[PDB]
């Protein structure tokens, strides 16, 4: 960490300790923040402390006997102490749905930023790459299994110039399984399928590479039609055809090679985290003095 980084993490932890127990009645809804794959996310105000939080709701029935362990598990699963993972305030349950309260990122997600930005400049994506790598490094240490992908909608930013990942250690699907595990977990997936589900960090690197190309050109780089047929044809194209690449003559050689090494089809030849962190693009980006906060505030009109 660095001085300002640890300090901000310390400050957040102080705020977390001051909040205490989280109950639904203590929240006032301000605005909807975004629409998720598993439930909507709202900007809320925690009245007793006056803290602005992001409140994610997950529709699920949790029985009273099951409830206490589920919550206690959720508290643990969200315990992050990284400057690159979105802060976590607490989780609770009321009336057939679960609330996950986290640090409000007033810059929104990068898919939202991308929409207003059109496309995101290479030097900005340099800072994004560094944060994602360090975020993935921290997550892989804490969890053996990831449950969420690297994608623009999962990269949150703010006016302090911070770039963070959502906690990949938890998903709405996992929580469902946890609730089911008290009745009796039944998996009918073959060993080879389960091995595929427990993907290595090489899959995260692929996702980062594809996301970087998407954000650099302002569009998901592999086009597809609508309907079931077009969906299958897209996935088959990803599996069996050459990966997408940046439009030639636009971006630096370093950034070009960086995303190409992330998108190599063979995961054994695909670059790993160590190789990426010392890549020419990363070393150049780390040296660059980039005003991310300034660009962000000008782009989405933060101030
Ligand atoms: N802590 C936060 N601060 C600000 N905005 C947030 C926060 N969390 C989520 N959002 C916004 O709400 C949207 C919904 O997030 P989420 O429910 O995680 O959807 P998702 O990530 O697309 N689903 P998944 O496919 O499981 O990752 C995000 O894309 C963000 O724009």
Residue numbers in the entry: 42 to 344
What text does the study give?
The extracellular signal-regulated kinase (ERK) cascade, consisting of three tiers of protein kinases (Raf, MEK, and ERK), mediates mitogenic signals and is critical for a wide range of physiological and pathological processes, including cell proliferation, differentiation, embryonic development, and carcinogenesis. Activated Ras interacts with and activates the Raf family protein kinases (ARaf, BRaf, and Raf-1), which then phosphorylate two conserved Ser residues within the T-loops of MEK1/2, which in turn phosphorylate ERK1/2. Here, we report the crystal structure of a cancer-derived MEK1 mutant, and demonstrate the molecular mechanisms underlying abnormal kinase activities of the cancer- and RASopathy-associated MEK1 mutants.
Among several mutants tested, we succeeded in crystallizing MEK1(C121S) and determined its X-ray structure at 2.0 Å resolution. The WT C121 residue is in the N-lobe proximal to the helix C (P105-H119), which generally serves as a regulatory element of protein kinases, and resides juxtaposed to the helix A. Firstly, C121S mutation not only led to destabilization of the inhibitory helix A, but also affected the orientation and conformation of the helix C and the T-loop. In the mutant, the relatively small side chain of the mutated S121 residue faces in the opposite direction relative to the larger side chain of the WT C121 and forms a hydrogen (H)-bond with a water molecule. Contrary to the previous assumption, the MEK1(C121S)-helix C does not move inward, but rather, it further rotates out from the N-lobe at an angle of 20° relative to that of WT MEK1. This excessive outward displacement allows the helix C to create a coiled-coil-mediated stable interaction with the newly-formed α helix (residues 213–224) in the T-loop, thereby inducing an extended, open conformation of the T-loop. In contrast to inactive MEK1, in which the T-loop is in a closed conformation and partially conceals the substrate binding region as well as the active-site cleft of the kinase, the extended T-loop structure of MEK1(C121S) uncovers these regions, thereby rendering this mutant readily accessible to its substrate. The R189 side chain is rotated toward the ATP-binding site and directly coordinates AMPPNP (an ATP analog) via the formation of electrostatic interactions with the phosphate groups of AMPPNP.
